[model samples]
Target: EVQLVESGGGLVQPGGSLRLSCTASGYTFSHRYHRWFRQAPGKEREIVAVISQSGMRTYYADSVKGRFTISRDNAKNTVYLQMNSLKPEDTAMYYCAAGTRKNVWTRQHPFDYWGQGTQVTVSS
Candidate 1:
């Protein structure tokens, strides 16, 4: 079993940067995969980043390639999301998800656990 908790939320002015955190427990930090997403009000969720349990590699969405970064710390069992050049459109809820696979051959592994989410509101 696993669980995730999101922290760090508040208001940010346009052009500023904000950092969010997701802490995990009840599982091996180096063996459970994680993913981050952005969801605007009433809008579909966008997968912003993904990281394997090894915490050695991360993939970012093309739409946020230049301004968003995702990283993880295995020692702390935590994941971080940093975004810069914030805009009003960036105001949304962010979520961190934990996932597992039954086997190496599993192709469509889904995230079964998620955090309550942190709401970030960006404005001038």
Candidate 2:
């Protein structure tokens, strides 16, 4: 089993940077794993990045790569994600997820567990 631990909340100004982390316990990343999703005021979750443990390779979608990074530490069994060049749109609930495989179809990749999600509010 795997669990995701995230920060409680954050407050930042525009043009600033935000860093969040997800610590996975009770499970190891020896198998295929990755994460997805971002929640804003109205819009739904977005896919940020997909990383492979064997080779430390990642495939980031263009919609998120410009200001986000998803990386993992095999030793700690933790996955850390950070977003920079913050804007108003970045203020939302960010969740860290764990998956055994990438979802080739719309509903195949299932992440049964998720963090409580940290609320990031940007102002000024």
Candidate 3:
């Protein structure tokens, strides 16, 4: 249960664009990997990317990078996530997180920090 604000609201009808924003105010945004994770209505969370502050270094797991793009605005301490060509299968709660590690070892890495969660609905 982390404290953060998510901005935006909408329901996607089949094919649509889903963009979410997460910004940190109580802490510094530098020197950490700002990331995005996706979780379906009743499923596990999946990694999207670990975006660096400079917007140049990114670690998108396995071949998923093709559908996800990560961007940052360090001045505002906000990170932006955009996933294109989104289908019904892509619907989920998109979360913004900051990780202490760059790479996760196995399926259980220490990632105890998480935003409350922004729920995005995909419809027909």
Candidate 4:
């Protein structure tokens, strides 16, 4: 019964920044099983970051390691993506996903839910 609803859209100018959000309704956000990914045109999807349920760890991909910040309000059941350094090549559909972690050493659990991706276009 876990689900996520994310919102963030419209055009963004190069070198700008934007904040995207995802509202969790069916599960507790403190589970920390949250992550984000972006699928760029003509390219394979790339992961951004993931947080541990215990809040003791966070894994960020090198792709956007220094350019992205992920945060959340467990009490409000919301997750945020602070995206920055926009560029024409940053156009993509960003998605928030959640899943269970069966292994502490390996992120092997298949994601349980994914929000309807929000399009982030860097232009102008």
Candidate 5:
């Protein structure tokens, strides 16, 4: 069974940075793509970043074009997301997921496994 576990702090302030981690297990971490997303208190999920298993290619959503980074440590099967220059509006619940498709670009990649998620609160 593929499992993803997210861990991170809950509090941050404006201009500060936050690093969220997702550790994967029970699967070939280096064989599938992973994605990070954020959800507001009552809004839909917003795509943040996506990274390939090789740790070579990465994609970021236009919404988080700057100050957001996605990285992976294949040896440890862990994915990380760093967000800087945070603001109050940046507070949200963040999640990580492992893509289901073998070919991430061939078709729509649905998230087959997901982490419990981390809640980030950006304040003054």
Candidate 6:
């Protein structure tokens, strides 16, 4: 079956780093686009970044542009979100999702497959 599983959930001290991971299955990473999202406590989720299927085009949200990076291990079918200069306010549920474009002009598509998600609590 097709699914995505996330790892690297825990309490992280402020200013620390986190490399959140998502292992994918039943899909070809090269044929689909991937995105990272952040849902802060009591807040709706927002896109942190979006990467093209070909890995040539990438877009980062303003909130994430300075301290976040996205990379993948194609051999393992996994994607990672690495964060730096993390602050306590960053503690939230992070999600990794994947999908393909609906049309040639579409910039992003609705995610049909989602990771179980990881909760990163930036605290003391």
The Cα local distance difference test for each model comes to 0.75, 0.66, 0.66, 0.73, 0.79, 0.74
Number of clashes found in candidate 4: 0
Q: Model 1: per-residue lDDT, tens digit, 15-113?
A: 888888888767665776677787987888887888777877778878778777888898898988888877787788988876653221113323335
Cα lDDT, model 2, residue 90: 71
lDDT of 2 by residue, 6-67 (tens): 65448888777877777766555545465645688788777667666552777676866777
lDDT (C-alpha) at residue 17 in model 5: 91
Q: Output the lDDT of residue 78, model 4.
A: 74
The lDDT, on a scale of 0 to 1, for candidate 6 is 0.74
User: How many clashes does the backbone of model 3 have?
Assistant: 0
lDDT of 3 by residue, 96-122 (tens): 876655542212322343455787666
- Which predicted model would earn the best TM-score? 5
Q: Give the better candidate number (5 or 6) by lDDT.
A: 5
lDDT score, candidate 3, position 13: 72
Output the lDDT of residue 85, model 2.
72
Stretches of model 2 off by over 4 angstroms after superposition: 30-32, 104-112
> Using TM-score as the measure, what is the rank order of every candidate, best first?
5, 6, 1, 4, 2, 3
Highest lDDT model number: 5
TM-score of 6: 0.84
Residue range 1-124, candidate 5, lDDT tens digits: 5577788858887888989888877777787788888898788878788888797888887766788899999998899998887788778898888883343222332343577878888886
TM-score of 1: 0.83
Tens-place lDDT digits, model 4, residues 1-124: 6568898866889888888888877666677477778898798888777766654666777866777787777777777788888777778898887665533122432343577889999885
- Which TM-score value belongs to model 3? 0.77
- Lowest lDDT sum, 10 consecutive residues, model 5, at 100-109
Q: Which residue pairs in model 4 clash with each other?
A: none
Worst 10 residues of 6 by lDDT: 102-111
Deviating ranges (above 4 Å) for candidate 5: 100-112
- The ten-residue window of minimal lDDT in model 4 covers 102-111
